[PDB]
Each structure stands twice: as C-alpha cells, then as structure tokens.
C-alpha cells in the first residue's frame, strides 16, 4: 500500500 | 534539517 | 633604552595598489552593463571574486562567487573559494563538500587537495587530512609549504614520525625555495634568530618582506602554540595578519587561530 | 513464471551508484559524530552486518558461501570509497540463487504428506545460528520451516490441500519477488550495512525513500492522491484521498486497475508486469503536471479507457495532530494526539489550542505515545507554546561545543499532561523532558526509548548534476548523527529515557526494546545544566496523585488483566523464541487463550451498566478496544487541575  | 526522530 | 626596537622585523602593512582599484572600478561598470553574455558574466564574476579576496573583502567575493554559480554550476574554481571561506568560517563539514565538488568537476585541481586537507585538519580528522596532504606533496615535492602542511597534520598523529618524515622531505628536496628555511627551524637545524636573519636577507622589497613575514609568523605561531606558549603564539598570529597578505593561507589560518584562541578565553 | 536459475537476473550496479557510494562515504567518514576509521577492521564488521541483512534467519547461505566471501571481507572499505561494489553485488546475486534454490526445495516438501503429532519445536531466533554446514542442513532447516508454516495455517483450521494451495501461492510469490529485484535494492542494502555499523540512527535513503521521508516530514505529496495495492500483475486502486485529484475527478473508482501510465508528450506505458514502486513513480509528479492513466475497470470486462489527471499537492491529514475532548461530568480535558513532529506541527497545535479555550477544557493531555520524533525545530517550538522563555534543549558536537536552542509567547498556560510510552522517542523525549524539567507538565506513562542524538539530513544531489548527467536518476539522501542532546538539566535521555512522574504498570516491566538494545548505540553521559527559570513546581502534588491513581487502577477491571497479563507474560519469556510445533498442544494453549480472550470483557460490563451482550460473542465485529492508559490519564489530568486550583 503506497500513495501515488 | 536537524532531525530528532526514531 | 628603546634601542631594542631595532630587533623588530616588520614590513609596512600592504595596501591596495592603484591597478587593483582601477580594475575593480572597471569591473563594476562592465557588470552593470549589457556587454556580457551569461558565460562571460560568470567568468567576470569569478574574476571579481578573486580580486575582492585578494583585498580582504571576503563576503563581497563570496557574493560574486555565488552569483557565478547560479549562472554556471560547473565551475570548480568557484567551489574552491567557497570551501576556503567555509573553512575560514569554521564550517568544515560544508567545506569538505565544496572541495569534493572541485575534484569531481576537475580531478586535476591540485589545490583542492591542499585546501580540503587543511579543512580536515581544522576539523580534527588528521589521518584523512594526511591523505590529501600527502597527495598534494606528491604533486610538487619541492614546495616547502606542502611539507609543512603535511607535518602539521602528521604531528597530530605522531610527532616523532612526523619530524622524520619532514626531515626526509627536506633531505630529498632540491632545497631551493625560501620556505625550506622554515622547515629547517622546525627540524632544529637552525635557530629562530637565524631564520629571521635569513628572512631579512632573502626579501627584496616591502611586498617581499610582507609575504615572508606573513608565512613565517604563521608557522612560528603554530610551533609555539604546539608547545603551549599561548602568548607567543598569539603575538605571532597577529604579526602574520599585520602583513595584510589577504590571499595567503597563512594569513587566513592565522586569523582562524586567533579566533580559536579567543573563543577559549571567552569560555574559561 | 520462473522455474529455473537462469531466470534470475544478474543484478548489476547502476551507473550513478559509484558516485553515490563515494558521496555517502565522504559524509559518513568525515562528518559523523562518531569518528571512526573506515579501515580493514571496520570493513569486516560491515561485511558481517551485510550478511545478516542478506540472510537474517541463517537459512539460505552456506557456510562455504560465507567463507568463500570472507576472504575479501576487509576489502569493503576500498569498495565503498571507490564505489565499485562487487562483493556487495556478487554476494547479493549468490543470495538470490540460494533463495530460489531454497524456495524451490520447499515446493517439494509441501507435496510430501506430513501432518504432525510429534513434540518437535521451532525457534524463531536464528539470528546467531551457525550457517548451515551442508545441503542436508539446509534442507533440514527448510523442512522445519515449511512445517512451521503449514502448521500455522492448519491451526486456522483448513484442509491440507488448501494449506498446500495457500502456501503454494506464497512460496511462488516469493520466487516472483526475487526476479523483480532491483539494482537499487542491493545498493540500498549495502549502504545500510555501512550506515548501521556506525550507529543506530544513521542511514542512506534511496531516491524513492528520500521522497517518502520528506512526505512524512511535510504531511504532503505531489501526485494524484490515490493509495495503490498490487494484486498479482495488477496495480489496483485501494482508496482515494479526499480532495485529491483522482477522487475529485469522478472518473476513477476504488477497485479500478491501472494498466497504463502516460507522460505528457509520450506514449502510454504498459505497466502490467511491474513492481509497485516503479508504477507509483510514473504516477507521481510535479503539481500542475499531467498524467494519463489507462484503466481497466473493476468488472470482468476487457475494455480499457484513458483518464487524464492533473497532479497536485495533497495533504495527508491522517498524519496530522488530532484534537478531542474527554468529558467527565462538569469537567473537560482536551487531548492532542501527535503522531510525529512534522514540519508545521506547532502551527497546527496553535489552532487546536485556540479551539480548546472555547470549550473551557480544564486540562490538556498531549499524547506522544509511539511518537518517534521528527524535526528538532518542531520540538523546540512546540515546547515554546507552553513555556514562556528559555532554553528547550542543549546540543553538543563531538568537540565539546555546546549550544542551547530556544524559542522566540505562551499559547496555553493551563494544567498539562504528557503521555508517553516506550515508543515515544527523540523530539518527543526532548519535549517531555523539558516540560518536566521546567515543572510545566506532569509526565505519565512508560519510560522512554532513550534516544539522545541529533541527525543531519542532507541531500546527495549536487547543483551541476543535471547538467552533466541528465540521464541519471535522482540521488538519495543521508541522515547522520552530528550531536548529542541534553536536557536543560544537564541530564541526558540517551539510553535512560525520561522517567514519568506516574508510571503505568507496563512501565515497571523489563523492556525488551529501546536505544540501549540497538547496535552501536552511543553511551550515556552528561553536561552542565543550562540557565533557566522554572515555570512551576509540581513535586508537592505527587504523593496525592500517586495514591489516587493507585486506588483507581486497583479497582479497574481493564487495569487488572493488564496486571495479570503481565505476570503471565513473565512466565513464558524463556520459551518465547521456541514454539511447539505440535498440532495438539497449540489449541490447548490456543483455545485456552481464545477462551481467556472471549471472557473478561464481562467483568467490566457487569461492573458497569453492563455495556453490551454476549454469552460468547465469539465472533465479534471489527472491534475497537478501549484505551485505559488514556482514560486513566484523563483521570490524572483532572486530579492535577483540581490541585493546582487549590493553591
């Protein structure tokens, strides 16, 4: 879970 | 910057 | 009586030449004009910076150097001065970064080794200083100041070994340059008075005398300081600065030493 | 997809890595607070550290592998200076093949039908185990490993074909991950081996990591505001940040899949067969910039559509300070939950303090539990809100130069409480010590982490980098310790931490975490106290606060399973790293636990109204547990305000  | 963390 | 004053060796403190002032004036007008390309401007700015530095106007030199970088960020020569200023300011860490840039941009920029080596020494990283200093020495073994700087660094690690290394450098050398005389004094070969006599003999004119005094008094101060004679060291550093040889490293570092001595006093 | 050793790509150091290595090396070697020589001895330690990073559980490499490499273990220093990182790389590569070999072996073991009722055990700490002497040992360890895994799934209660199916997807996934490894993955690892050898708080951050750290520091990021998850080969959108570009567009939804990414004057790049980070990197960009996304909609349909979005600055509100009011009858107490000392925190607190005035809150609790720290300036400024003037902290370099940091007035003058735990560190400790040293606030919780150093964060980018190497990616960043920090006391929280005025029960138990357990942590020491004026004095109020607190926890039900939970925890620490491996016994322990777990909620309810109903609510909802430390703290806060009021 990474924010872009 | 100067950091005081973890 | 006061006949003693005769023993003092002093030059008239250096003053700006007419040509220096004339050039500065012309530079201002050119910079204020539309006659320069961006590349030319950067170059001129470096040139003014060098001139300002030569007159003891360091902050003004730094502004010029900074502006040059803003135009062209690939000037090793600019980074070199900035490192030197950072060292003078006691900001050794930043200074290291600057010297690296000089080398990265141009690995043949030999003086960076000397300057980074000097900064590391003031920074208390003697062995690392020694690597730069040894390399600087290799480039010109015949330059006595290269040996002196290396000795100062090495002395922190082992005084005995440093002396032997210095002696070898001296013996190994052509022995031509004036600076070797200072080295002989450090070595015990000659006395201080003899060193001074030789200095008087070597110098030709006032500028020559001032330069000799600037370098010599700085090294003498370091020598006395090393021995713990604080008052003698202090007088010598002031005496070095009095020559107004603004661009010599001996001059810059004498000022730094004075500043360190001052801080200590202010503590306790 | 991968079935052979030749499907494992040979990792190669990037073109810019050498330069980076050199840059990190210059910084670490010349400017670290710890003056070390990067000599042969140091180099060997780095090698040892790298191996542990490479194979934490001494499971993959053979002793012959280690020993082959140990022959060049003192060469690491020369490599870092040079930036030609062959041993780090050669070793990583060998580790890859070994990992693959291991996983492939595990694939076999799973097929062997074994369900077991023996008494054989598994140890979780293989940290110091000797390397496997031979293949037999390796297979045996892995035989042991696979057993542990299947057993754990079986403990959930599945079948055996499932467990095989579940584990199959796992070992296979692990194999895929290996084939997806980066040159960067290795370079980051090598730098970390080096950094950590120096001290526990020294790091190298890769370009992506640097970006992340900045975001955590600033509470903001530049891109489209979408949280991405990777399922198999597809980048799926998990959620959308409110007020962000993807969310505001109304052309993108949760569950949508991004199979294409397009830069403004370039083609749409298929990203199906990609690592998550490589994809996120394409998506993120400078605000005002445009990105076009090829989206495969959430259903079973095969049609794709292209969505174009304008990148923008997005704030992560979740990470910001949060304010709440706790009410106990007529009295109210405000609480500030501070996750970190992010830039701009003090400002954020000021507005919150302003709101609190309106509500006429009697006391304020500042919750630093689990607050790792952050910016030093933020620590100083936050302190300044509560303290009128003077030094907040003292800093000292390696050469004895001492400096004191202070603020510019007081924003809140009322009763204050700082809540801390074993995980509250650094800036959090600085603030807590200062409030305590000035007599400003009472400190409640567990003893601190023991952080006592200051790190310098510096980018490795040089101004002419773009000009001379446009093709290069961004370089990363480093954090390195430059100084030790001391309380105004002249005291130090290095190793010790700060001891709360009131300590929760978990507080008196031997901790297993902290600065003191980290590798190469600097020693505790002290300096002369600075000059400051005490804000107030709370030493008088302590016995009364103590007894009142003590009486309350004694009765409290929640504050009792904690006590009992503690002695019980004490009972099994010795056998803590060893798990049974017997299908029979775990369940006795396991259900013996679930049972214990599904019960004591009841004594609290009966004690109260009761709260809810469940003969056995064995299958509860998404449960939010209560927060007794905080609830008790609030009780302490009210006691404090009462006493202060009676002065």
Numbering used by the authors:
A (entry chain E): 1 to 4
B (entry chain F): 1 to 6
C (entry chain B): 21 to 288
D (entry chain D): 25 to 432, 435 to 673
Q: Can I see the authors' text?
A:
The levels of MepS are regulated via proteolysis by a newly identified protease complex consisting of Prc, a soluble periplasmic PDZ-protease (also known as tail-specific protease, Tsp), and NlpI, an OM lipoprotein with tetratricopeptide repeats (TPRs). NlpI serves as an adaptor protein that binds Prc to target MepS for degradation; however, interestingly, the latter two do not interact with each other. Prc belongs to the large family of C-terminal processing proteases that recognize the C terminus of protein substrates. The lipoprotein NlpI has the dual role of bringing the soluble periplasmic protease Prc to the OM, where the lipid-anchored substrate MepS resides, and enhancing the efficiency of MepS degradation by Prc.
We determined the crystal structure of NlpI in complex with catalytically inactive Prc-K477A (hereafter termed the sNlpI-Prc complex), at 2.30 Å resolution. The asymmetric unit (ASU) contains two NlpI molecules forming a butterfly-shaped homodimer and two circular Prc molecules binding to each side of the symmetric NlpI dimer, which are angled away from the OM. The NlpI dimer interface involves mainly the swapped N-terminal helix h0 and a 10-residue linker to helix h1. NlpI binds to Prc mainly through the TPR2b helix, which contains four exposed acidic residues (D113, E117, D120, and E124) engaging in extensive electrostatic interactions with Prc. Helix h1 makes electrostatic interactions with the TPR2b acidic residues of NlpI via basic residues R47, R51, and R484, while M493 and L494 of helix h14 make hydrophobic contacts with TPR1b–TPR2a of NlpI. The extended N-terminal and C-terminal helical domains (NHD and CHD, respectively), which associate through a pair of anti-parallel β-strands b1–b22, forms a bowl-like structure with the protease module comprising a vault and the platform domain. The lid-like PDZ domain is attached to the bowl through a double hinge, consisting of two loops with conserved hydrophobic hinge residues L245 and L340, which are connected to the vault helix h9 and the five-stranded β-sheet of the platform, respectively. A conserved open substrate-binding passage containing the proteolytic site, as seen in the structure of active CtpB6, is located to the side of the bowl near the hinged PDZ domain and is formed between the vault helix h9 and strands b2–b19–b20, and three parallel loops from the platform, which harbor the catalytic K477-S452 dyad. A co-purified peptide is bound to the proteolytic site and co-crystallized serendipitously; the unidentified peptide is modeled as poly-Ala. An unidentified peptide is also bound to the peptide-binding site of the PDZ domain in each of the two Prc molecules. Interestingly, the peptide bound to one of the PDZ domains could be tentatively modeled based on the electron-density map with the sequence LSRS-COOH, corresponding to the C-terminal four residues of MepS.
